Amino acid sequence: NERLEAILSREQNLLEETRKLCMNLKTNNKKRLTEKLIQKDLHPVLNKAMEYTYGLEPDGPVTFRNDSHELNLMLNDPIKSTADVRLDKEEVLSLLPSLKEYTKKSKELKETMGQMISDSHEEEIKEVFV
Amino acid sequence: QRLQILDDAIQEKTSELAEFENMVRSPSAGDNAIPGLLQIIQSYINLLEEN
Amino acid sequence: LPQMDLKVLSEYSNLRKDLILKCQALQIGESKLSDILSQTNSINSLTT
Amino acid sequence: NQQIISVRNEIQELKAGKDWHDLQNEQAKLNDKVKLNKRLNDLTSTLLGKYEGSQDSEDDSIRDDSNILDIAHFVDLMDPYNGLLKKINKINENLSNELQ
Amino acid sequence: STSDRSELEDYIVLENVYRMFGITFFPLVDPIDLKIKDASGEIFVDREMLGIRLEVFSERTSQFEKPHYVLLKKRIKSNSWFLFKHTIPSFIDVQGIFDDTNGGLVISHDDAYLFAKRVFLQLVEVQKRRQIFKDLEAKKIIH
Amino acid sequence: RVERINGLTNLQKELVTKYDTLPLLNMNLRLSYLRDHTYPHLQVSVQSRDRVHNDGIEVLVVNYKFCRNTMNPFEIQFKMFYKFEDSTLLKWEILRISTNVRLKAKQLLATRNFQKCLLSLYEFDKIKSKKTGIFQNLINLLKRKTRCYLMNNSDSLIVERVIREGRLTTIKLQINFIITMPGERNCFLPMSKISIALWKGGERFNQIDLDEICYGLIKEYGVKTGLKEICNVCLFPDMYAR
Amino acid sequence: ELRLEDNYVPTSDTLVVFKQLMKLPVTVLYDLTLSWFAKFGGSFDGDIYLLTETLDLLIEKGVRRNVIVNRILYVYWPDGLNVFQLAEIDCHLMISKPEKFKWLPSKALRGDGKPYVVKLQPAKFIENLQTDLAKIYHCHVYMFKHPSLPVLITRIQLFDSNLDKFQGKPLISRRPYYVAFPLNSPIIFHSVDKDIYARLVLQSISRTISERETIIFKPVQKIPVKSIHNIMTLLGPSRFAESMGPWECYASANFERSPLHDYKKHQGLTGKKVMVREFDDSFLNDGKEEPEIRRLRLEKNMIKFKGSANGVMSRYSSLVPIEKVGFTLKNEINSRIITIKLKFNGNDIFGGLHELCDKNLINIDKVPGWLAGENGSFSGTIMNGDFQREQ
Amino acid sequence: RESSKAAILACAAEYIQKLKETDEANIEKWTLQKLLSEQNASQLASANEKLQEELGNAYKEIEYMKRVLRKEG
Amino acid sequence: LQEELGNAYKEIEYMKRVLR
């Protein structure tokens, strides 16, 4: 009976913590909408995203979710970080030594390809053929 | 060790790209003759299309 | 991973930051390797 | 025991609820819009000046796709099938058929 | 006749050529939705149906697997397809894929083909995974 | 009254005698569906279905003409060997490829399972047409305000605009729509990638946060509207410097 | 320590176990005896090979199962059967007689609302379930795979506490709770019980499956159905789910073959024989009709109710017999919502309706889809011609 | 669709509360939409004024280099 | 007005390039 009393106390503490977290998240989301991005600092190209997102709730994320399967599209996905710890390019380049090797190898290969293209004179004969 | 095998695969790919880079490096300086021939052909084609 | 004697806390924060850098380097290396694999695919297609 | 079962069922219903997932998704959306708006303001500021921060720099190729573009253009250039030389040869055969 | 038999013969061959793609649309009528207009007896379908079939090619057996049929009926009040019946097992959330297609409602044949392709990719995934593991078994590499 | 219905039955006569859930046997209607709805802009043609009846093997030769780009459509020609009972594809070979798709198809068709090959070819044709449509829409939107020209063989759009802030320095934006055919590696469908690159007077912007902005705008507004807002952000600071 | 191991002996009535082993055949008793003595042993003295030879002498003596039941309950294990024995005999009874058990389906919804395709690591799942339920009750759980079906059936048994009752030192068992896990399906079948222990078992199962994101089980049906094979045909991860009644032809694919097949045997070339159905109201007006068109209308009813001309194979028996269905048809006749509540009862609802259609009591040209067996074993409301199930 | 009387009454209470929340949320959404529309209109007017004065300066530059070129020839 | 501003800037570039 005492063991089950302890179990119930732990579960009730977890329930109170979860309900408090849910209410705090709701009020924090409302305050973040009210105090951060609805002000004059909002970029004017995001004025239309705000309109369908909160103004009157179509052409937004539904369109992209249609297009990512229509076009088999990828984008350059964001680098997942937490707690505002931004990516350190020097650290990850020191962590992958072969990235700089590819940098110089691709620079050499691009230089060779560019001088080959310039010797080929494709752009000069392209414009005079149309 | 995951980053180690990732960097090993990347290094193998760079070795392949460097093998291709030595394979394509052909020294030449014949772009001037091709440009002159292209200019002459374009001028003659414009003259023919003008008729 | 959450973040917070003093030396143990500093070691934990340093290890967590190092693991975050490991994750960032892992995603960057995976995307880069996919790009290089596509390039090598095109190069081998032309060569063959 | 019945109280324990009831409160654990309440935990399951609340943690896997629809409103809780709505709040989590809404927090993700607010974070994305805040970061995107900040980056857009920074981009238009840098693109017009008076930024007071870097931002406009590119020296380490941590993520570049101009090289794959160049590879595709080079491959399209000297393709043994379509290429540039085979287009010229096709023009030669078309002119030969038109003339002779 | 024999000329009409020839043209039906070529039509069947062409239909098989189209079904070689994997994702095809076939016409379908629900017998309940058959009503007469009573002007002269023209039986018209009330609620239009659309059925798709998903024939995945099993390269290991060099055979076509048995088709999975998804049948879409028009809503009476909104003029949009809905997931009426399907023969796809429950580990592929066809209802979730259909609701994800164009954000819920689908109207044009492009959205129906997009949903069909999205679920045919899952069929390709499971068939290819099973093919790789069965080939691993066939090469006697694993027990 | 007992009626026999075949593949050439009238639609009205079929609806007269319809009490089952099987698909309609009106084969003209079936091929009308197959041509107009599931696979539009594809002129398929079969010209020889001869057979070796001693072996029980059917030899089929078909021509797929992907005519979505009507100016220069690319066409392919297959040869299939049936089994005609206990249906097994013993052998398939590619008889002829048009030269303008010959390299990408040469990398794709090297692998087996030709169903993936046909679906990938049709999807690549559709995606290339979508690319041309999107680039034409952006060109028509920005033809007069900026300078629009295509390069990298119509895989990259360059939009240039001079700006007031200095001695009329130029701002150029490069947007990419490269399309990749899976030859070495994670599925069979032809994939597409969008990335942007911004220059102001010859200085490249940081690609990380620029790609973050491209990802955010495309994620929010889709592809056409997303690229329109990328162009508006990266070409017109004066419109948004309030 | 409150978890119950596989060597504890509970207090079980000897007569109940006696009549319980009577239903099992002799060969499963033989296999059980050798497996039990190889794993746990018994009070009988002898080598494993010696006991195998003794049971061999028993089986070529042709002795009745009663004698070997008395042996295994009186000399092999006279003190009492272990919990593993008591679970395994009842699971073998479930395998032998599947029609004596009723199951209730429950979808495994998660997070946003997309169903969770549950996958089990069986030994780790059993260990985690036993440790989770050990905090509350004295729990023993046993898990096995069906010899025929692709499922993973568990058996959760809970034990409680304990004029002058003298002394027993017992641990009284309750009725076991069965939860059936299909291999890859969000639908979870569990035994029919609504007491607090069944809710506890389902709750602990939902807490111990998840381990990544919180999972709730939402019941998709409140009417139990017998015969676990039938509930895998209905709600399991098969083609017959969401294609039932008139649409079983699509779930069986008996009407189209591969596109790589002979085109002389195509349906459009050979054709099919049908009849002109009269759309005018002539069923209510009407003897010794022609036996060829009578066969065609019998085939029409067979097609409408089972999907196939020859059926999935007396002949009225459907693929899955349904016990109870209730449909609430709603229409809008001149801005008035008109509800009709049809409730059904029997051993096979749609087979009986097919028989009534064959006797010209129900018009087969006007019997709707939901009445014909479409979305079978689901009871719901038909609004605007679309069937949405109840909750 | 519900069956029992208690379930019908509970669902009716839940639906009435949901409609009340929907009405309040729609009021807040309309106020935010009006704020967005006012911001967009004012910002577009400001951009029109800015590029109008920029075009005036540009035409002054047209005239300046025009008279400079006439001075040169 | 953006079209007019672009034409005006093109004219500025013309008179700038023709100048010394």
CB contact under 8 A, B10 and C33: yes
- Distance CA(F77)–CA(F96), nearest Å, equals 5
- Residue G110: name the closest of G200, G216, G221, G233 by CA: G216
Cβ pair G212, G91 in contact under 8 A: no
Contacts 24+ apart (CB under 8 A), E9-14: E9/G263, E9/G269, E10/F46, E11/F7, E11/F27, E11/F28, E11/F30, E11/F31, E11/G268, E12/F7, E12/F27, E12/G263, E12/G266, E12/G268, E12/G269, E13/F46, E13/F49, E13/F60, E13/G263, E14/F31, E14/F34, E14/F44, E14/F46
**Residue with the two structure tokens 């993973």:** G152
- Containing D66, the helix (H) or strand (E) segment is helix D66-77
> What sign has the CA pseudo-torsion A24, A26, A32, A34?
negative
**DSSP secondary structure string for all residues of chain E:** --HHHHHHHHHHHHHHHHHTSSEEEEEE--GGGEEE-SSS--EEESS-EEEEEE--EETTTTEEPPPEEEEEEE-TTT--EEEEEE---TTS-HHHHHHHTTTS-B-SHHHHHHHHHHHHHHHHHHHHHHHHHHHHHHTTS--
CB contact under 8 A, G199 and D4: no
Query: For residue E39, which amino acid is it?
Result: A
**Residue with the two structure tokens 């016409």:** E27
Enter the DSSP assignment of F92. Answer: E
Cβ pair E120, E53 in contact under 8 A: no
**DSSP secondary structure string for all residues of H2-69:** --SHHHHHHHHHHHHHHHHHHHHHHHHHHHHHHHHHHHHHHHHHHHHHHHHHHHHHHHHHHHHHHHHH
Cβ pair D37, A46 in contact under 8 A: yes
- Distance CA(B27)–CA(B5), nearest Å, equals 37
Q: Which domain holds residue F225?
A: 1-239
Cβ pair F195, F201 in contact under 8 A: no
Cβ pair A76, F211 in contact under 8 A: yes
| Neighbouring chains to E with at least 3 Cβ pairs closer than 8 Å | A, F, G
Residue G140, SS3 per DSSP? strand
Q: Which residue of F has its CA nearest to E61?
A: F88
F178's CB contacts (< 8 A; 6+ apart) are D65, D68, D69, D72, F155, F192, F193
| E76 and F CB contact within 8 Å | no
CA distance G260 to chain F (A): 6
Q: Which residue of A has its CA nearest to B20?
A: A109
Q: Closest partner residue to B17 among C26, C30, C40, by Cβ?
A: C40
Q: Which domain holds residue E37?
A: 1-143
- Distance CA(F190)–CA(F188), nearest Å, equals 7
**Residue with the two structure tokens 């900040």:** D38
CA distance F168 to chain I (A): 8
**Residue I4 with chain H: CB contacts under 8 Å:** 55
**Residue E72 with chain G: CB contacts under 8 Å:** none
Q: Closest partner residue to A54 among H32, H40, H43, by Cβ?
A: H32
**DSSP secondary structure string for all residues of C18-48:** HHHHHHHHHHHHHHHHHHHHHHHHHHHHHH-
Residue F38, SS3 per DSSP? helix
CB contact under 8 A, I13 and F145: no
Number of domains forming the structure of chain E: 1
CB contact under 8 A, H40 and A44: yes
Cβ pair G244, G375 in contact under 8 A: yes
CA distance G344 to chain H (A): 16
Cβ pair G268, F7 in contact under 8 A: yes
- Distance CA(G333)–CA(G339), nearest Å, equals 11
Q: Which residue of C has its CA nearest to D76?
A: C46
Number of alpha carbons in the 13 Å side-chain half-sphere of residue E42 = 5
**DSSP secondary structure string for all residues of G208-273:** HHHSSS-EEEEES-SS-EE-HHHHHHHTSSSTTTT--GGGHHHHHT-S---TTS-SSS-HHHH-EE
- Residue G352: name the closest of G379, G315, G311 by CA: G315
> What sign has the CA pseudo-torsion F53, F59, F60, F61?
negative
| H64 and I CB contact within 8 Å | no
In this structure, the strands spanning G215-219 and G225-226 are unpaired
Q: Which residue of D has its CA nearest to A38?
A: D34
CA distance A4 to chain C (A): 30
Cβ pair G104, G189 in contact under 8 A: yes
| F162 and I CB contact within 8 Å | yes
Q: Which residue of F has its CA nearest to A123?
A: F151
Query: For residue F56, which amino acid is it?
Result: G
What the block records as the tokens of G316 is 């009225």
CB atoms within 10 A of CB G113: 12
| Neighbouring chains to I with at least 3 Cβ pairs closer than 8 Å | F, H
- Containing F167, the helix (H) or strand (E) segment is none
The total number of residues written for chain D in this structure: 100
b/e per residue, E20-54, with b = 16+ CB within 10 A?
bbbbbbbbbbbbbbbeeeeeeeebebeebbbbbbb
G145's CB contacts (< 8 A; 6+ apart) are G151, G152, G153
**Residue D42 with chain F: CB contacts under 8 Å:** 209
Q: Max Cα separation, chain D?
A: 101
**Residue with the two structure tokens 């699509």:** G250
CB atoms within 10 A of CB G276: 11
Q: Closest partner residue to F2 among G266, G273, G307, by Cβ?
A: G273
What the block records as the tokens of F98 is 């048009």
What the block records as the tokens of G18 is 């006696």
CB contact under 8 A, E103 and A62: yes
In this structure, the strands spanning G102-110 and G138-145 are unpaired
What the block records as the tokens of F114 is 């030709």
**Residue with the two structure tokens 């036996």:** G291
**Residue A3 with chain G: CB contacts under 8 Å:** 135
- Distance CA(C43)–CA(C40), nearest Å, equals 5
b/e per residue, E93-118, with b = 16+ CB within 10 A?
bbbebbbbbbeeebeebebbbbbbbb
CB atoms within 10 A of CB D34: 14
**Residue with the two structure tokens 């409150």:** G2
CB contact under 8 A, A11 and D4: yes
Work out the angle at residue F188's Cα, subtended by the Cα atoms of residues F183 and F190, and round it to the nearest 5 degrees: 80
Residue G106, SS3 per DSSP? strand
SS (H, E, C) chain A: CHHHHHHHHHHHHHHHHHHHHHHHHHHHHHHHHHHHHCCCCCCHHHHHHHHHHHHCCCCCHHHHHHHHHHCCEECCCCCCCCCCCCCCHHHHHHHCCHHHHHHHHHHHHHHHHHHHHHHHCHHHHHHCCC
Cβ pair A80, C27 in contact under 8 A: yes
| I3 and F CB contact within 8 Å | yes
- Distance CA(A92)–CA(C24), nearest Å, equals 8
- Distance CA(H71)–CA(G92), nearest Å, equals 110
Number of domains forming the structure of chain F: 1
Q: Closest partner residue to D71 among C28, C32, C43, by Cβ?
A: C43
* Cα first-last separation, chain I: 30
- Distance CA(A122)–CA(G252), nearest Å, equals 59
**Residue F33 with chain E: CB contacts under 8 Å:** 25-27
Work out the angle at residue F231's Cα, subtended by the Cα atoms of residues F225 and F234, and round it to the nearest 5 degrees: 140
| E136 and F CB contact within 8 Å | no
CB contact under 8 A, E62 and F30: no
Number of alpha carbons in the 13 Å side-chain half-sphere of residue B6 = 20
In this structure, the strands spanning G380-383 and G326-332 are parallel
Cβ pair E31, F18 in contact under 8 A: yes
